[PDB]
Write a structure and sequence with these properties.
Chain A: It comes from Escherichia coli O157:H7. Chain A: One of its GO terms (cellular component) is ATP-binding cassette (ABC) transporter complex, substrate-binding subunit-containing. Chain A: This is Maltose/maltodextrin-binding periplasmic protein. The complex is a heterooctamer, with one copy of chain A, two copies of chain B, two copies of chain C, two copies of chain D and one copy of chain F. Chain A is α+β, with helices and mostly antiparallel strands. Chain A has four domains: 3-43 and 182-248, D-Maltodextrin-Binding Protein, domain 2; 45-170, D-Maltodextrin-Binding Protein, domain 2, CATH 3.40.190; 328-373, Single alpha-helices involved in coiled-coils or other helix-helix interfaces; 376-427, Ubiquitin-like (UB roll), CATH 3.10.20.10. Chain A is 49% helix and 16% strand. Chain B folds into two domains: 4-112, Immunoglobulins (Immunoglobulin-like); 119-204, Immunoglobulins (Immunoglobulin-like). In chain B, the strands form five sheets. In chain B, strands 2, 6, 7, 8, 11, 12 and 13 form a seven-stranded mixed beta sheet that branches. In chain B, a hairpin with a 4-residue loop joins strand 4 (30-31) and strand 5 (36-37). Chain D is mainly beta. Chain D is built from one helix and eleven strands, in the order βββαββββββββ. Chain D has one helix at residues 28-32, and strands at residues 2-6, 9-11, 16-24, 35-41, 48-53, 59-61, 69-74, 79-85, 93-102, 107-111, 115-119. The chains are: A alpha+beta, B mainly beta, C mainly beta, D mainly beta, F alpha+beta. Chain E binds chain F through residues 15-17, 56-58, 60, 65-67, 69-71, 80, 82, 84-85, 128, 130-131, 145, 197-203, and chain F through 381, 405-406, 408-410, 412-413, 416-417, 419-420, 423-424, 426-428, 430-431, 434-435, 444-450, 465, 468-469. Strand 19 of chain E pairs antiparallel with strand 16 (445-452) of chain F, so a sheet runs across the interface. Bound molecules: a molecule of 2 linked components (BGC-GLC) (2 copies). The site of a molecule of 2 linked components (BGC-GLC) has 12 residues of chain A, from helix 1, helix 4 and helix 12.
Chain lengths: 428, 204, 207, 132, 207, 484, 204, 131
């Protein structure tokens, strides 16, 4: 294949594995940063049936009441659509700090993610939500009016337009008073010169963008003029509201397995075969990059057969992963032993800074020490016919050193003291 | 860890014939993939760092003479010296390096030879000793192989014997009699009488 | 030639801390793993600590786990061992040794060893040796009343080494140490070095 | 009650190993009422506990192996399983399957034959063949 | 165990190009240097090429410099030798060997060798062998008119190996090769494999 | 608190500022080289060495404040940034300028070539020991420290050997030879001569102004004259303060930097002591923007280039210094000095190898470019190529007598091992002098293949093969003749 | 590059005694830093890849027996086998790995034994070979120690002798007589006779 | 005209080595009438010229060694040097000091004893002492 049209998450891994700029939006180029040309910006939205309800629900808690009144369903197989509920309560794929993604920190195991997933499985068990439904069945149900609401992107709108049923698009409802944070995908083209020029001066045009959008709605197009002439449509406005409420998808190569992991967790979470915490732990273990297949399988089995120590298992797996990657509390605690004299305190803190991974040991034995706990060097020069040499002793003053040196001379068969070099010289 | 036990604590032998030193393991130390037994034999001469002699329990290290050979398997391993030489007196350790690192208890190798008559010396205390307040008189035996000799002091006594040297293969010992200065002054004649398998020295 | 030299040893009180350094020369220090191994007269050789090439993997002995810390500085070609909360059983001589590359493929064990530094832990205070000549054939000198063990005794600054007989130090009832060194002859000065007391004594022996 | 162990051998540090113990000569509720666990011993050392599961199904671990090791008891198949992950050279020992039962007045311990676990710390063995 | 497998050999016309691949298994391929060594009956063993572990250092033989290229792919554990402008003196068997780590410290030379591939260069074209069973005790079959030399001959798919005598091929007056393989007996089929001609033939020998 | 600055800056003014804030200040000589080996709490210096200091860990990273970021000019913040983090607080921007005596000459010469005529009429002189002052003449004609491309610096490329740098250095040494410029003069002698009015011109920064202000003689500053029609491009330095990582008063020093000396009264006090030039802070710079001297300094800075921050700069300075000194005293030629500096620049060369290359350039200058190329290749080989590769590619793709298979093989070899390209190309050329089908399968039991241009030829060959071995259906679908 | 030349080349010996094969170097291959001579001895059995036997010219590789021993220095080195065994027939190469990599000419170790009487077989051509246009009769001899053996044909013949096997240590030979089709039926009786130290086979 | 060589031995590749040659038995001007250079010979190949300096003071180098090798002529001291930098294992050879002079009708050569130079292609010996 020459060019691939897809969301911007996988092009980063593809690149890892091997005036025109001003014509598009800057964040679109920044997201694909260059490896791909942005074409469309897509975000999920809540599409409801106008005849079913006058106004959409604002909170996720009210949706079960409306559904049981009907007696909500969408694509459950793909994590993409279910992710906003998880991300609403603090769930994040990777820690985005000072503009950089921290692969070492993964927030899928957060408590808010647990609350979102347990609310989803509560919807599943109450028969309000279908665990085995997919995108096609959800589209068919919304086209036939079986479901009052659905979660879908711009592309399905034309298909809904084929069903001629009145549909209203809006922002996804808030979860526990917190708005959702859907992933914002950038549908862009990645090249495996003629194809590049055909993308540039033919596809990236108002006529080309409008021709593509007529077949299937691209949502937010990267081209400025078509965005300006298409911003009048309120559906695009709702899509951008969802986008700013959401977070852009990362470009790091660590997403694909991540997606796989999340998918498995959702498949574990929806079917009821495993609890929310165990599914999240399995997803976290699958996310971990440097674990060997045998090690990952062993950790998976250990999490499966005993969920009591899941936190300790995750900590040990993270430690092993950091060890195979190609203390501050201890620092504060060590300084606070009162009876410990200064010398061993520096020794222990030097060991702590020297080897962090032994800190849990180094702290503990220090406590085992704590309960247990609770001078000038002068030189003699003998210039004698019977004894020639020099020796040293540590003393608090020249007087104690003088007695010590005189005793040493007494056991060994004119005394002068040079204070500048702290030297007693004895001449026989 | 896997600690090892060496059977002979010490063994004496004359020069020219064979010696065998064996050591036992608590478990098999055979690596499955390599099919190689991970064990080594080390030699440590007195006052020196240990020197590698044999690795993998059969392979011979570079520069090691052909007399040293290694054998055994399972949990029993033997080091054999075909022709022991006088400068081969040392301590031999068998050491596994498969799981962690542990060393054997150590086997000491002695050298047997013909009897030799000891050389006797008597040494009085020096005057700095005298005015320091304590007196020490020494009786010295030099160049006697059998490592058996009795020393008696005639008018609280410390005997120290050196290590068997490589060239002569004999021993040296000193008996020190330590007393106070007054104890030195009251008595006059001091004798040390040494009896050995292979004599009294006195001063006034 | 490969050369490993340790330093930092001496006499320290129980419960104190001590840092041992080992300098390596003659090979790429940044590629070989290092071992600290201690030896005592009553217990013998045993392995104390091990550090990998890139300091990513470190192992400790059972009895020294949590007390000792191993590290290395590749740019400075140095290997450091920090001991904290020392106990009376730790009196021993320490060596730094090299681990050959890929011992799981070729099987070469610890091959090159350093000279070793003697660490002794006790409540008693250090004391300078007392040197006494011995009037004479053989003649010698004996050193008495020095608590730290190491005392190197040579003759004429190593000019002669034939007939030298230096006897091991013996503990008396007073808790000090003493040893006599002699040479058999048909000028002579005996030199004693006591590193913990920083004592250098050259004594001339004459009748 | 006769206890038999299975699994073990030599393993590289950082690997995984699953030991199993099977009990015979006992009815289901009987050994349900007795706790079951894993002890280990190195030569020169005493008998230390690495895993235990009480009659109520609560797991107790030694602090050095908590999180790394996992104990599971299946009543129906009469089997206890110890899964050991992220191994280090300090973990090589003889492992004993053990049963703790109450005779009210005191405690009684049933012992198995035990299995050997040797963690072989070795360089350049990431891609070595094992079945060869 | 450490294993090395070569592939890519065959028959090529003079002046053409060829590629030889050596796959390594059982060890960390990304840490060892590799050698390409060729051997011929009238030339014997002679080193051809060498590449370091990180492909930074490469060396070539004097007679092959400028024509041969040595390289490696660490992620897939492969070693490539590209041979260009081949002359008639390049007909040989090629092996890939592994150079141990730090041979300036332990002196271990090239230790593990592959099976090797037979590379032959000539202007003539290939031709499949003609197999003829022999009426008998001893019985066998002869292969005749096959231009590329390699012909592996087995009996009953390797069921029997005692008494199997396979004579070396000799060059005929027509430029083709022929050899006979026999087995001493008190069903018997002989299987011939001709890799450059990709010819597998099973022939049954009966009176 | 211990502060180390250069001796020509405002030490007394900073001392008064610290006394207003205890604070100890010193100005040791050669401080920029003893600082890395000693490790003062904070050091005032140019941004070039701070990159190496941060790489070695000698300088602690500073946590900034967004308002404080907005307080100063942005390019000062970008210039003091190494690997995306801030290590020092920008204080002043210094650029070299030409200072002339108005009575001696009404207008400064626009070109360097006119300066010999003016000097001969007099019968200009400045510091020669420091490469800092010599560099504008070298860099006027296209010389550069490192290739600045697309916003990153190329360490592998060094421009001290360009023909423009050679022309500039030859011009300078020609001025030396004609007795117009003393080769042994330094900064102190230049300052003494200009204060006494002996010399009509000098090259110096803002800090000298106060000194010449003590001379009570009128002085005018302007842009340095052009060289061969090309304006001079002096390096643009940023004087900033770096904090020791081992300083026990790190937070105290940080608060001192943020709240006391980087404020209007502190900058005005140090400027009264010694004119710091263009200050990074907006308000005081706008206050001093009316002064024509600061305008001339800014014009020189725009005409010049901002001094880089790579840790490979220090040795570069060293190399250039030696070359300039080797150019100054006449011990060796300009080309030899530049070659020696170029050899000294690359770090990965061993000391023995570097000495060997020094001797190689000493005893044979006819092949200097070959020696430099070989040394560069050795340096890249030991470093912890596409130039000739594309040329070899283009030459081989044009090869007329080479068939497609051999061209593909040679192309693969070139892409695979580029360091042996030069030999391989020749081999291909050698071959250029010498040169001036469907596989069908047969399924006596066995299978064979033969390469044939059409079905009937393969049928004939297979029938012959069957004839010799004592033995028909044909399948286009599997391209196979089956005999039964 | 350093050229190595191996003196003995082909060499025959009976099983049980010692053999010494020497090779000379053009240049000294003594590394100065560690005082180790860089030379290795490799053994290659027929149809096998070379197997390392000795490295550093004195050290024995792991797994090799103690019969093999390497000696020599300067520019002359020797490899000695104390007790040659029936499976020791191979080609031995001395190879230096200090400057580049080069191999010696290779010495072939041949094995002597008692003479054996060959077994003679006459093998007719097959009919599919006959109708192909040529004919070939085979005269085969099996299990004889001495390679020297004359073969004559009775009615331009090709003789092939196999490599001596390690187990039995005798030889096999095959003489093929090829002719045209018409020449094949113009003659009627065909015979091969052999003269050997340790007989005519004819057919119609 | 007797030629005496000095220098050589074992070198790690990429290292440097300086060889010297001294001519004797000829006067100053007559030696300035000669062209002096270095040849090298490997076992199995004929002698080839690696460097040469004519009487004009110009230098001529082999193609494969240009840049890496340099040759210098101190004609006042009857002395010549060859500096070899960035060596390779293929550079191991015996180096021969060579003197060529024209006899109008022909050319005549003088060869020295020669010195042995070996390049050791080992890997882990970079830090190795020399004592
Ligand atoms: O499997 C989850 C995938 O989610 C995204 O792909 C989305 C895409 O963003 C959306 O526009 C469209 O509906 O296709 C899929 C729906 O899953 C990620 O881009 C992928 O990496 C994930 O695999
Ligand atoms: O001379 C080489 C040094 O140049 C600069 O240092 C200058 C500095 O820019 C200037 O403000 C002051 O007068 O001191 C020196 C004068 O040379 C670089 O900052 C240094 O790294 C160079 O060594």
């Amino acid at each position: 294949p020459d060019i691939i049209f897809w969301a911007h998450d996988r092009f980063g891994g593809y690149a890892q594995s091997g005036a025109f700029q001003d014509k598009l939006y800057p964040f679109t180029w920044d997201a694909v940063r260059l490896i791909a040309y942005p074409i469309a910006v897509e975000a999920l939205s809540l599409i409801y049936n106008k005849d079913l309800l006058p106004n959409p629900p604002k909170t996720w808690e009210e949706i079960p009441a409306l559904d049981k009144e009907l007696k909500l369903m969408f694509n459950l197989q793909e994590p993409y659509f279910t992710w906003p509920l998880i991300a609403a309560d603090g769930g994040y794929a990777f820690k985005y700090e000072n503009g950089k993604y921290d692969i070492k920190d993964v927030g899928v195991d957060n408590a808010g993610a647990k609350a979102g997933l347990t609310f989803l499985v509560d919807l599943i068990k109450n028969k309000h939500m279908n665990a085995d439904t997919d995108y096609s069945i959800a589209e068919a149900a919304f086209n036939k009016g079986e479901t009052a609401m659905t979660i879908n992107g711009p592309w399905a709108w034309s298909n809904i337009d084929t069903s001629k049923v009145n549909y209203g698009v809006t922002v996804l409802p808030t979860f526990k008073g917190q708005p959702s944070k859907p992933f914002v995908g950038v549908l862009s083209a990645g090249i495996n010169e003629l194809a590049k020029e055909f993308l540039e001066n033919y596809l990236l045009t108002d006529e080309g963008l409008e021709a593509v959008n007529k077949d299937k709605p691209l949502g937010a197009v990267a081209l400025k003029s078509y965005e300006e002439e298409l911003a009048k449509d309120p559906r695009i406005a709702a899509t951008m509201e969802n986008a700013q409420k959401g977070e852009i998808m990362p470009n790091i190569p660590q997403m694909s397995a991540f997606w796989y992991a999340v998918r498995t967790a959702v498949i574990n979470a929806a079917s009821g075969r495993q609890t929310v915490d165990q599914a999240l732990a399995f997803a976290q273990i699958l996310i971990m990059p440097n674990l060997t297949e045998e090690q990952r399988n062993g950790f998976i089995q250990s999490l499966k057969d005993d969920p009591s120590v899941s936190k300790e298992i995750l900590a040990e797996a993270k430690k092993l992963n950091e060890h195979q990657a190609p203390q501050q509390s201890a620092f504060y605690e060590i300084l606070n032993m009162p009876n410990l004299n200064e010398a061993q305190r520096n020794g222990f803190i030097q060991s702590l800074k020297d080897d962090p991974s032994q800190s849990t040991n180094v702290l503990g034995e220090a406590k085992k020490l704590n309960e247990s706990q609770a001078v000038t060097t002068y030189k003699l020069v003998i210039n004698g016919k019977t004894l020639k040499g020099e020796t040293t002793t540590k003393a608090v003053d020249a007087e104690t050193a003088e007695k010590a040196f005189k005793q040493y001379a007494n056991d060994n068969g004119v005394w002068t003291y040079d204070d500048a070099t702290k030297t007693f010289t004895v001449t026989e | 860890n896997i600690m090892l036990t060496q059977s002979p604590s010490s063994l004496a032998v004359s020069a020219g014939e064979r010696v065998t030193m064996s050591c036992k393991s608590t478990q098999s130390i055979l690596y499955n993939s390599n099919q190689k037994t991970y064990l080594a034999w080390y030699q440590q001469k007195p006052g020196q760092s240990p020197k590698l002699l044999i690795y993998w329990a059969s392979t011979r290290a570079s520069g090691v003479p052909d007399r040293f050979t290694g054998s055994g398997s399972g949990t029993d391993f033997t080091l054999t010296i075909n022709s022991v030489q006088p400068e081969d007196l040392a301590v031999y350790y068998c050491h596994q390096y498969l799981s962690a690192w542990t060393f054997g208890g150590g086997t000491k190798l002695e050298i047997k030879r013909t009897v030799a008559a000891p050389s006797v010396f008597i040494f009085p205390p020096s005057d700095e000793q005298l005015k320091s307040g304590t007196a020490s008189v020494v009786c010295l035996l030099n160049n006697f192989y059998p490592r058996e000799a009795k020393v008696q002091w005639k008018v609280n006594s410390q005997e120290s014997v050196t290590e068997q040297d490589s060239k002569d293969s004999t021993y040296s010992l000193s008996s020190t009699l330590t007393l106070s200065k007054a104890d030195y002054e009251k008595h006059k004649v001091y004798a040390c009488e040494v009896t050995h398998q292979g004599v009294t020295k006195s001063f006034n | 030639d490969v050369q490993l030299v340790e330093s930092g040893g001496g006499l320290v009180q129980p419960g104190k801390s001590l840092r041992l350094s080992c300098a390596a020369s003659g090979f790429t220090f940044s590629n070989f793993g290092m071992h600290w191994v201690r030896q005592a007269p009553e217990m013998g050789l045993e392995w104390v600590a091990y550090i990998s090439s890139g300091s990513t993997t470190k192992y400790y002995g059972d009895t020294v786990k949590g007390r000792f810390t191993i590290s290395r500085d590749n740019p400075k070609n140095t290997l450091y061992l920090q001991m904290n909360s020392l106990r009376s059983e730790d009196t021993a001589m320490y060596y730094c040794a090299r681990r050959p590359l890929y011992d799981g493929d070729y099987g070469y064990p610890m091959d090159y060893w350093g000279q070793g530094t003697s660490v002794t832990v006790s409540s008693a205070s250090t004391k300078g040796p007392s040197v006494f000549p011995l009037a004479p054939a053989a003649l010698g000198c004996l050193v008495k009343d020095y608590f730290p063990e190491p005392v190197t005794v040579s003759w004429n600054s190593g000019a002669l080494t034939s007939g030298v007989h230096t006897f091991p130090a013996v503990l008396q009832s007073s808790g000090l140490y003493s040893l006599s060194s002699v040479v058999t002859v048909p000028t002579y000065i005996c030199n004693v070095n006591h590193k913990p007391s920083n004592t250098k004594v050259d004594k001339k022996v004459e009748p | 009650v006769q206890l038999q162990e299975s699994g073990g051998g030599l393993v590289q540090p950082g690997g995984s190993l699953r030991l199993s113990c099977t009990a015979s000569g006992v009815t289901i509720s009987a050994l349900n009422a007795m706790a079951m666990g894993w002890y280990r011993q190195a030569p020169g050392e005493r008998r230390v506990m690495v895993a235990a599961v009480s009659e109520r199904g609560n797991a107790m671990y030694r602090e050095s192996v908590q999180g790394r090791f996992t104990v599971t008891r299946d009543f129906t198949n009469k089997m206890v399983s110890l899964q050991m992950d992220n191994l280090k050279p300090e973990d090589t020992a003889v492992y004993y399957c053990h049963v703790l039962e109450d005779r009210v007045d005191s405690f009684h311990d049933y012992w198995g034959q035990g299995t050997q676990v040797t963690v072989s710390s070795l360089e350049g063995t990431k891609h070595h063949h094992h079945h060869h």
